[PDB]
Structure formats: structure tokens, C-alpha cells
Amino acid sequence: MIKIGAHMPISKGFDRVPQDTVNIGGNSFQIFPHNARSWSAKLPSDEAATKFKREMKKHGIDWENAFCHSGYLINLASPKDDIWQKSVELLKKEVEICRKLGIRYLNIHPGSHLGTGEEEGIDRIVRGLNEVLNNTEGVVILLENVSQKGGNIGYKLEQLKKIRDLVDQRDRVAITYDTCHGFDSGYDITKKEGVEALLNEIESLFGLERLKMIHLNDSKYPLGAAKDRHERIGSGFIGEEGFAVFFSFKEIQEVPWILETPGGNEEHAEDIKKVFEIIEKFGIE
Template sequence: MIRIGAHMPTSYGFDKVPQLTVDSGGNTFQIFPHSPRMWKASLPSKKAADEFQVQMKKYEIPFEAAFCHCGYLINPASPKDDIWQKSVELLIIEGKICQSLGIPYLNIHPGSHTGAGEKEGIDRIVKAIDEFLKTVPDIVLLLENVSPKGGNIGYKMEQLAKIIELVAQPERIGVTYDTCHGFDAGYDITNKESVEKLFDEMESFLGLWRVKMIHLNDSKAPLGKPLDRHENIGKGFIGDRGFRNFLSFPQIQNIPWILETPNEEDLYTKEIAHVKSLIGLINVDR
């Protein structure tokens, strides 16, 4: 089953997300567990969490198709002890929010070493993840590939693989593949041969089974230029032809696709329909 959706707002309440998702033409979604630009976060009330779960069942969205994305301030690779500690503490709260809602996945950017070096950054990431995993049971952390800029770690598959290799509970680590970030890092998805090469690399370093979510984003920058500027599907350098090629591969057709493009006015309704048209789907079964 093809699952497609978008990053949805929670300003109306967690319980409104399932209906907003279905109304937009989606059957999967991603949300922030709290305001992403704040260090402060709190658990939803039991009433709010219970109502969210009721609405998930009402709109027939399985919890395996629901994702949380960590806040922007979190940097598990930070060499600064205060930032690292605050990042871990907030990550743990976010994990507990996921638990209360019943959402099994929390997506994180591995972070930036900010000049301290890749090895130091990976060591810090692993330490942060281990602290999270021993404190928050059940939740699966998804490491997202990132754009190769500003000391970022995780723009190469082998970097993600190294983190997974070193953590204490590797079975609780999955991966999110972001098409814009990958394009920044030189992973071309506009032709068959390049996609096959990407999948071979994923399988070799990670195992394709670890890929639990795909962020569908076109790129405002050409291949290999690390700007991290998302564009609407078909309007960037990947283009409709590139996405039609990428999405045609059966390896990713059972993985939820989530839009994070600069298009929130209609809650992605037109863009979800556009992606469906690229793969020849007018209606997608929920």
C-alpha cells in the first residue's frame, strides 16, 4: 500500500491531526511533539492523548504510519556539555510524548560537531542515543540523513552506519531518507542507475529494512550543492521526472512518504494529489 502524507500542524490539537491528514488526501503524517524552536516541552494530558488515539482509530490511520520529528534546537553531537545535556533531556521528553500518544517513531537529525571533528561528534551522538534508549522504552529513533554543511554528521550512509554500529541497542534504530538532503550530498535520484546505486549503498551499510520513512522534498539547489533548501515537488532540481523515477521503485512503496515542502496553505492537499498523479494514482486506499 502506498502511504503518503505531510508534516501536519498541531496548533489545533493533537486530536485534530488524523482528520486533517485524511482531509488533505493523506494516510500518514509527521508532527512536532512540541514547539520545535523551544527547549521547553511537556507531556499532553491523558485526555488529549486518549482523544488522539480515538481519532487515529476513527480515521483508520495505523500508529505505524505516524511519526514525530524532534525539535530544531536538539544537537546530540554538540561538543558543548550544556547544549548536549539540554539536547538529551529534551529528546527524552519528546520520546515520552511519543509514548503517551502511541506514536512509535521519533525522527532526529544526528547533529553537528561544530568543528570538534566527526569522531568526537559520533561519540557524543552515540552517548546521547544510549541515554535516550535506556530511559525511554519501546520508541524507535530514526536517524535522518542530512545536508553536508556546518559540521553535520549523517550525510553519508557510512556515518549513519557507524552510529548504529556503536549504540547499545541497534535494533531500536531506524533511518529516514530525505530526498533534498540526499541530493545535496550527491545522491542523484533522477535516473534508474543512480537510484539502484543508492539502494545498494543503503542495503550494504544499513539494511533497507531500517528505512522507516522518506521525506519527499524537491531541492532548490543543484546536485551536490549543500544548501538544504526544500522546494515543492516538481519545482526544484529533482523535478517531476526525477520523482516519477524514484517513486516507481518497489523498494520504497511500502515506506511512508512525508512531504516537508514549503507548502502549508492548503495543508498539502494539492501537492499530495500531485505526487499521486506522478505515480498514476488518483485515489490511495487508506
């Protein structure tokens, strides 16, 4: 029923990810596309990509439940042309990594304008997305909501809509909702009226079909804190009671839930168990 997993390490190879996912009790995952520390990234070898696909098949992982997260360096809103250009080129490479692996989705944070203006930053993001999308095929870019820190763009869903609606290939732009980033920004999923408002907002701005992933993160801080410090499920200010409200909506259950909570595979296995404990304890249908 539930589509759930975690951000998984790739350091031992992409092909380990399907088994590792099953081993933590998941049926979905997110991975980085590389471990580059600068502006160039290698492709997986032919052998590595084939082995990954083989393991995906062996473990029966639904390809609609497998996601890449773009690297930490890319910033399509940067007012520094160096950074903008290098970001565009690395994002193209990340799309090609996804395409080689068969991954259908590449999730990005829109960017930060570093205090040079939301409108101008949105236009730079759009320009960058057009350069990437118009020179690649297949892969859909997911825009993730973020916290309101520095010059970040995307702390309100309206900002994601402004970007998406300007991109040429808007069918290749969809949305990821991160519960911690959202909670930081005033999206109060701890009350049913807050979840209803969130869903109404998604439906109006994008259509619900565009919600492709939820990043399921508790928060170390209260509603509105703008801190971006994730917490283990049930251990933060969203809490067991808040997640029970969020989980109760069928619209939410339809979308994969990907943990980005503190820790590694073992903590994530515990968090998946906690999610099911919450569903059971609160009698969620």
C-alpha cells in the same frame, strides 16, 4: 497502495491531525512533539492523548505511518556540554511524549559537531542516544540524513551507520531518507542507476527493513548543492521526471512518503495530488 502524507501542524491539538491528514488525501503523517522554544516541553494531557488515539482509530490511520520529528534545538553532537546535556534530557522527554501518544518513531537529525571533529561528534551522538534509549522503552529513534552544512553529521549514509552500529539498543535505531538532503549530498535519485545505488547502500549499511520513512522533498538547488532548501514536488531540480524514476521502485513505494515541502496543509494537498499525477502520467506500476 502508496503511503503518503505530510508534516502536519499541531497548534490546534494533536487530535486534529488524523482528520487533517485524511483531508489532504494522506494516510501517513509527521508531527512535532511540542512547540517548546527552549529546553523543556510539556506532555500532552491525558485527555489530549486519549482524544488523539480516538481520532487515529476513527480515521483508520496505520500506526506504522505516524511519526514525530524531534525539535530543532536538540544537538547530540554539540561540543558544548550544556547543550549536550539539555539535548539528552529534552530528547528523553520527546520519547516520553511519543510514548504517551502511542507514536512509535521519533526522527532526529544526528547533530552538528561545530567543527570539532566527525569522529568525536559521532561518539557524542552515540553516548546521547544510549542515555536516551537506555532510560526509555518502545520508541524507535530514526536517524535522518542531512545536508553538508557546517559541522553537520549525517550527510552520507555511512555516517548514520557509524552511529547506529555503536548504539547499545540498535534495534531501536532506524533510518529516514530525505530526498532533498540526499540530493544536496550527491544522491542522484533522478537516474535509475542512482536509485539502485541508494537502495544497495541502504541494504548494505542498515538492511532495507530499517528504512522507515522517506521525507519527500524536491530541491530548490541542483544535485550536490548542499543548500537544504526544500521545494514543492515537481518544481525543483529533482522534478517530475526525477520523482517518476524514484517512485518506480517497489522498495521505495513500500515506505511512507512524508512531504516537508514549502507551505501548509493546502499546498501539501496539492503536492499529494502531484505525486499521483506523476505516477499516472509516467505510467508507473
